[PDB]
């Protein structure tokens, strides 16, 4: 059904709350140097294997998302989420989730 902006924001707050838990738990069971769980205001990026592309299904709670696609981040061999080259922002590809990209 036609989700409203207020409903969408509510689901984001609920998803953001789930991301806080997944972070606290991992930060209570630490192991190795993987990329840490991270909330980017859209979805919760999970533990990333270092040196690899991390793929996350386009979240089901975003109404205007293609839920058959994936969003992507890059986790380097140091366990840090890779920045965009030449910029100071974390690299993420959402082109599969959305029509205007």
């Amino acid at each position: 059904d036609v989700m409203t902006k207020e409903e969408q924001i509510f689901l984001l707050h609920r998803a953001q709350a789930q991301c806080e838990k997944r972070l606290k738990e991992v930060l209570q069971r630490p192991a190795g140097r993987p990329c840490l769980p991270e909330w980017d205001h859209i979805l919760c990026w999970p533990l990333g294997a270092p040196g690899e592309v991390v793929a996350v299904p386009c979240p089901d709670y975003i109404y205007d998302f293609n839920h058959k696609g994936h969003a992507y981040r890059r986790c380097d061999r140091n366990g840090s989420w890779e920045l965009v080259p030449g910029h100071n922002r974390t690299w993420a590809n959402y082109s599969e989730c959305v029509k205007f990209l």
């Binding site: 910029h87 974390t90 993420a92 590809n93 959305v98």
Partner: peptide, 21 residues
């Protein structure tokens, strides 16, 4: 489309949070 307020809100999240330019 649907709610343009919802759509245009997602425009902002995608604009700052899709960073591959």
């Amino acid at each position: 489309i649907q709610d343009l307020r919802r759509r245009f809100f997602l425009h902002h999240l995608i604009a700052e949070x899709h960073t591959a330019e």
